[PDB]
Design a protein around this nucleic acid. Structure first.
Ligand SMILES: [Zn+2]
Ligand SMILES: [Zn+2]
Ligand SMILES: [Zn+2]
Ligand SMILES: [Zn+2]
Lengths: 89, 196, 129, 157, 36, 61, 56, 228
RNA sequence: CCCGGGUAGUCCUGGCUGUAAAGGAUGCGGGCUAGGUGUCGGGCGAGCUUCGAGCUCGCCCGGUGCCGUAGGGAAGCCGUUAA
RNA sequence: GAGUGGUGGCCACUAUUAUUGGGCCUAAAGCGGCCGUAGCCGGGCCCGUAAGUCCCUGGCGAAAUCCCACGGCUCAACCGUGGG
């Protein structure tokens, strides 16, 4: 029995030094002028969370599943990441 | 029965096999003699001979290999190739003839004819690699593996091989259209077999 | 000694399919084997099959159409609910809705797809894909 | 495979699929029962009675004839014998095993160094115990019944 | 004594028979010293 | 091997040469088959097919 | 798309780089026959869809 | 277009040597799909260079391993180079080759040539439970491939999820065209030759599984090149 | 190590010890997965016979060896006597 | 990157604990061999009960913690309102 511990909102790369990942991340950093790699990893994990939610909801059946699918699509459209006529796919 | 008389078949000894036997040719085997020797079915041999002649009449004349490592079968193959225009390779089959393009005598046929699978395993192996139809003269103890067409016969004999190749060449010529009738063929059968 | 005629029959079918046979005989016969064969024929994994009486449990003659990649019995016969089929599908099949899990339910033996359609569970008795 | 020797011997009887007695049998069910009873009086065991009926009288098997007293079952040598009250008190196979076990013990007492025959006796007694357990479970023999060579001597006698 | 067939190989080792004999001698010496 | 094994033995109609009695016997007897009237041996047991010493009239199924 | 050849005996699709063969029917000559590497090795019989003629 | 003129030039300069080469030069064969599934032998790289010229792109050619090798003679050590390379187009055609030489360059040319000769055809699709689309972005279904002691199991994965497989395996899959897959490996994966050949066999085995016509629509199965 | 002698032992009758590269370095029962060819016991059919419980060929079941297809394995090799 | 290094501990790495899912001829490992008690696994068909099993429906399994949507602190961390 332990209490809650606040967790990190970003995930570090599995391997610190990979040539292709380093080059790609460097290009993204230079283009978008981010301060450090933790911001980029935060956005990357946001994308990963969205993708994981979509994958989990694709193979789910139940009223709660439909509600969550609709809420996910509505939230993405509100954020502007998807067009109005988007689909879960 | 129809191609040549049963008397000629028996004289050529096409029906005499060997002591050994395999289940691959149980259908072709006719009966068993008290000495343990097995006798083929002349009916089956004739039917498959007609079928093989019809099949071979459809190919380009210079795209048919005839191979036989057996000394008794070398000459009939040579004369069959000479008559039909097909290529014949009596004797030792040079490895890589069909597989190595750098060989001097490189050639890629459309169909292979083997006097004996066991004696011509090399040619059969190369033909399997290249992927072309195989026709084989099969005896009672021969396997039918990798054989697209099988002619049951006594492939070890002299007169048997000569008569088989004589009948074959005649059928290919008749079906192709060189001769208007079977009896028009003029080359004597006795010429096919070698002397002693 | 003999313990699972269903497993014996399914393994025999798999081996015959691998070798490339066209006909197979299953012995001993049973109602469970008959129903499994019925389901397989319904889904088109096998051809015509018939029963032969011999004064004993009986024999099944089955025609193979070269359409089975692998068929096998499931032991132990795990019970499964309607909402707990995805894990078994992943365990026993290559892709989603690729093969079929033959399940014995209270309304007879049927494929897991039919079980889900009817909204009932059962026990996994075999699989084939 | 065999229970002890562990080798696969597939020798046995090949019974053809049948559903009714042959049309060429020259005896009625009552005559068959009379023959079974008279042979049992003579003293042959059930297996011998069946063999004699098959050989001499040309009766393939009594199991082919329906039971006139119970339409739900077919006839049998043991069923006929118990209908007439001649059924063995102890099962025949168990009795045979016990008889040859006591004979083997008689031999072993005189030949104490026959270890191979002693092993054979051990296997025979294991078979006897298996059959005793099965018969106890099926209720054929009393629950307090036990196999003991001393009592088996009298039982065989 | 328990069986370790890997010990029978002679690559860089003394014969296991004689190692075993020596071990028995050592055990017997220890037992004598204890007084059993 | 066979899917539906069948017996290789057959029943035989036999006429006894001594008395002329008709009888039905097994081809592979395990005992000494005898006539039911004169008590004369008809078939003797062996390791396989029995040796028949009485006239054979028919072979049944 | 394009048609994938299938065996006449077993009906299974033939892989891109296996020792399979194809040839017109020796008897009639209208229908073609395909043989798998496995079928050829095992000497499994084949039947023309038209004639009914059977056997390698 | 550049690869099209390259094909035209090599066709002009090429003299046939084999039956398939003569057939291609004459023109009876005009699509790469027509040389497979017929039992022919490919002993001349000009056929591949003509029918699928994009395989000659440096970005489409990859070298997977370079190994020094030694054999003892009374005069010393004789050193040889073994180069394992992979080639193909990113649309469903891939090939793997091994070349031996006295120098890295000779080994590389021989390995690339053998990979061209060994090119094969694969089937792609989507069979993941979490994706259930009809695009050829992954393997249609789970497949197995074994070589030496290395066993590789490839499982479909949802779109956007990269290649979850060793470096050489993902290189081979990228060359083939696949871009989403999960992996499960057993044995000595550090043996690069065995691992690469196991992945090659796993990709090749996609043609050895019987599928009903409905499965093609269900999984969006595409053989060789797609709508491209 | 080689050569002449030699005690215990090796042998028998009652016991104890329970150990081996005690190895097929492979636990046991069951269903299925091409063949070929040796040999032992039994049964079936045919032909010979000097009429022999004799000889030869074919078939079925159970033993005991070799080669080998599919396939398995790191390979050696195993492969209906499976590893 | 206001963090970055060193040491100990736990999980993955490790299908080196293997129900999913490991091995035992030559690398670790088949008791020298067999008989058999508890346990485990057990031929075909019919009828009956429903203990296991499956489906539906009431009473429970505190809150906080976990996931989703909206709203309030500038967004967030945090908190509230609903669903799970
Ligand atoms: Zn009489
Ligand atoms: Zn035809
Ligand atoms: Zn096929
Ligand atoms: Zn997808």
């Amino acid at each position: 029995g332990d209490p809650k511990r606040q967790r990190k909102k970003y995930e570090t790369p599995p391997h610190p030094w990979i040539k292709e990942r380093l080059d790609r991340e460097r290009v993204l950093m230079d283009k978008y002028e981010l301060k450090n790699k933790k911001e980029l990893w935060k956005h990357e994990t946001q994308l990963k969370n969205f993708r994981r939610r979509a994958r989990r909801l694709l193979a789910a059946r139940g009223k709660q599943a439909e509600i969550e699918r609709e809420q996910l699509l509505a939230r993405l459209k509100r954020l502007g990441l998807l067009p109005e006529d988007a689909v879960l796919d | 029965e129809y191609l040549v008389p049963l008397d000629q078949y028996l004289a050529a000894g096409v029906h005499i096999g060997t002591q050994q036997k395999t289940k691959d040719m149980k259908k072709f085997i006719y009966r068993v003699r008290q000495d343990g020797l097995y006798v083929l079915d002349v009916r089956k041999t004739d039917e498959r001979l007609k079928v093989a002649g019809k099949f071979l009449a459809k190919f380009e004349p210079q795209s048919i290999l005839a191979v036989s490592v057996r000394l008794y079968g070398q000459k009939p193959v040579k004369k069959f190739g000479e008559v039909t225009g097909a290529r014949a390779i009596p004797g030792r089959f040079l490895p890589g003839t069909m597989t190595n393009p750098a060989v001097k005598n490189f050639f890629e046929p459309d169909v292979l004819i083997v006097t004996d699978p066991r004696a011509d395993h090399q040619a059969m192996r190369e033909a399997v690699e290249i992927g072309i139809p195989i026709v084989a003269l099969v005896d009672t103890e021969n396997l039918l593996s990798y054989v697209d067409l099988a002619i049951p016969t006594n492939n070890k004999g002299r007169k048997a091989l000569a008569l088989i190749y004589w009948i074959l060449a005649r059928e290919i010529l008749y079906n192709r259209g060189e001769i208007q009738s079977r009896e028009d063929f003029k080359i004597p059968v006795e010429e096919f077999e070698m002397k002693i | 000694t003999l313990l699972d005629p269903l497993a014996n029959a399914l393994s025999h079918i798999t081996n015959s399919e691998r070798v490339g046979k066209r006909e197979v005989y299953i012995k001993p016969a049973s109602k469970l084997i008959g129903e499994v064969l019925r389901v397989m024929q319904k889904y088109g994994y096998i051809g015509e099959f018939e029963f032969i009486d011999d004064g004993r449990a009986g024999v099944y003659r089955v025609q193979l159409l070269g359409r089975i990649n692998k068929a096998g019995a499931i032991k132990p016969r795990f019970p499964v609910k309607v909402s707990e089929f995805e894990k078994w599908e992943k365990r026993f099949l290559p892709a989603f809705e690729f093969g079929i899990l033959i399940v014995s339910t209270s309304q007879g033996v049927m494929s897991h797809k039919e079980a889900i359609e009817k909204g009932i569970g059962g026990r996994l008795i075999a699989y084939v894909y | 495979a065999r229970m002890h020797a562990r080798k696969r011997g597939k020798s046995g009887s090949k019974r053809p699929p049948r559903t009714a007695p042959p049309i060429w049998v020259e005896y009625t069910v009552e005559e068959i029962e009379n023959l079974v009873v008279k042979l049992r009086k003579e003293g042959y065991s059930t297996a011998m009675i069946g063999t004699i009926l098959r050989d001499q009288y040309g009766i393939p098997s009594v199991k082919l004839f329906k039971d006139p007293d119970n339409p739900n079952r077919n006839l049998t040598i043991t069923r006929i014998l118990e209908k007439h009250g001649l059924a063995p008190e102890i099962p025949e196979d168990l009795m045979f095993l016990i008889r040859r076990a006591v004979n083997l013990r008689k031999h072993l007492e005189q030949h104490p160094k026959d270890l191979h025959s002693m092993r054979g006796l051990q296997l025979i007694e294991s078979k006897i115990r298996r059959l005793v357990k099965y018969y106890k479970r099926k209720g054929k023999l009393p629950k307090n019944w036990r196999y003991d060579p001393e009592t088996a001597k009298l039982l065989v006698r | 004594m328990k069986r370790r067939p890997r010990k029978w190989k002679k690559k860089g080792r003394m014969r296991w028979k004689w190692i075993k004999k020596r071990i028995r001698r050592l055990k017997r010496q220890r037992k004598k010293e204890r007084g059993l | 091997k066979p899917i539906i094994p069948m017996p290789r033995s057959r029943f035989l109609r036999v006429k006894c040469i001594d008395c002329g009695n008709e009888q039905i016997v097994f081809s592979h007897p395990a005992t000494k088959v005898r006539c039911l009237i004169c008590g004369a041996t008809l078939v003797e047991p062996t390791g396989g097919k029995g040796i028949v010493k009485a006239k054979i009239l028919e072979v049944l199924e | 798309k394009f048609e994938i050849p299938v065996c006449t005996s077993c009906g299974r699709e033939i892989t891109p780089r296996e020792h399979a063969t194809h040839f017109i029917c020796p008897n009639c000559g209208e229908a073609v026959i395909w043989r798998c590497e496995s079928c050829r090795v095992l000497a499994k019989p084949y039947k023309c869809p038209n004639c009914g003629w059977e056997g390698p | 277009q550049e690869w099209k003129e390259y094909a035209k030039r090599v066709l002009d300069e090429w003299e046939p040597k084999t039956k398939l080469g003569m057939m291609v030069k004459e023109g009876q064969i005009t699509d790469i799909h027509e040389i497979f599934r017929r039992g022919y032998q490919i002993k001349e790289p000009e056929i591949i260079d003509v029918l699928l010229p994009e395989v000659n792109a440096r970005e489409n050619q990859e070298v997977l391993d370079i190994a020094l090798t030694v054999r003892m003679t009374d005069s010393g050590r004789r050193v040889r180079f073994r180069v394992l390379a992979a080639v193909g187009n990113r649309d469903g055609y891939v090939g793997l080759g091994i070349g031996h030489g006295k120098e890295v360059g000779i080994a590389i040319r021989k390995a690339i040539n053998y990979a061209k000769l060994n090119i094969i055809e694969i089937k792609r699709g989507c069979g993941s439970w979490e994706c259930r689309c009809r695009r050829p972005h992954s393997v249609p279904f789970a497949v197995e491939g074994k070589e030496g002691s290395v066993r590789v199991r490839l499982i479909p994965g949802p779109r956007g999820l990269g290649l979850v497989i060793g470096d050489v395996g993902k290189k081979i899959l990228r060359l083939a065209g696949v871009q989403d897959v999960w992996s499960q490996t057993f044995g000595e994966t550090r043996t690069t030759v065995n691992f690469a050949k196991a992945v090659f066999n796993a990709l090749y085995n996609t043609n050895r599984v019987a599928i009903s016509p409905e499965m093609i629509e269900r999984y969006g199965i595409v053989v060789g090149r797609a709508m491209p």
